[PDB]
């Protein structure tokens, strides 16, 4: 487990590793906003 003083930040840590994948997805979102020019 994490140190206890960080315990309330346990759910946020639980979603931290999938942030890079979103970055890849974000690229497509950006390319959709400019119409894939």
């Amino acid at each position: 487990k994490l140190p206890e003083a960080y315990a309330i930040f346990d759910p946020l840590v639980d979603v931290l590793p999938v942030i890079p994948v979103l970055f890849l997805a974000l690229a497509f979102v950006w390319q959709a906003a400019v119409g894939f020019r």
Partner: peptide, 30 residues
């Protein structure tokens, strides 16, 4: 519970497209 993880991931996954939407709204370099 699980609702906390869902709230966190919803906020992050909207934080991305919020950047895109804000740039499109104010006519940024997007």
């Amino acid at each position: 519970e699980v609702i906390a993880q869902l709230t966190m991931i919803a906020m992050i996954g909207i934080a991305g497209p919020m950047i895109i939407f804000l740039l499109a709204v104010r006519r940024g370099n997007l």
